[PDB]
Design a protein around this ligand. Structure first.
Ligand code: ADP
Ligand code: MG
Lengths: 52, 49
């Protein structure tokens, strides 16, 4: 509600109580920093794989 | 017209057409955490600087 002295999150964050305890995975922590790879994966269908 | 004191906040100043009145008291209402203390602080800081 109020954290005096610096910035912070202001939205309502759904949290969970589990065996570990408090767990909070805010949706505002996701970032678009994804290392890409040049390898290819095999679907298992030869025709579909060759189509691309 | 009446006197007005800019508060540094450009958007608020242009909304008020100059800023808060000069020589008159102003009330800032709001629950805890709304930002009244910061509003006053930037008021003073911008006025001085
Ligand atoms: N560095 C900062 N960046 C962003 N927001 C801040 C920062 N510092 C304080 N705040 C905001 O200021 C709020 C408190 O402001 P303040 O006016 O002092 O309390 P109140 O609104 O109860 O009078 C906090 O809830 C926080 O959101
Ligand atoms: Mg306050």
């Amino acid at each position: 509600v109020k954290y005096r002295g610096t910035a912070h999150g202001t939205n309502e964050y759904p949290f969970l109580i589990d065996t570990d305890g408090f767990s909070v995975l805010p949706v505002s922590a996701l970032g678009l920093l994804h290392q890409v790879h040049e390898e290819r994966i095999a679907s298992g269908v030869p025709d579909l794989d060759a189509m691309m | 017209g009446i006197g007005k004191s800019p508060t540094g906040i450009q958007g608020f100043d242009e909304l008020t057409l100059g800023g808060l009145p000069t020589g008159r008291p102003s009330l800032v209402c709001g629950s805890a955490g709304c930002g009244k203390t910061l509003f006053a602080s930037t008021f003073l800081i911008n006025g001085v600087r």
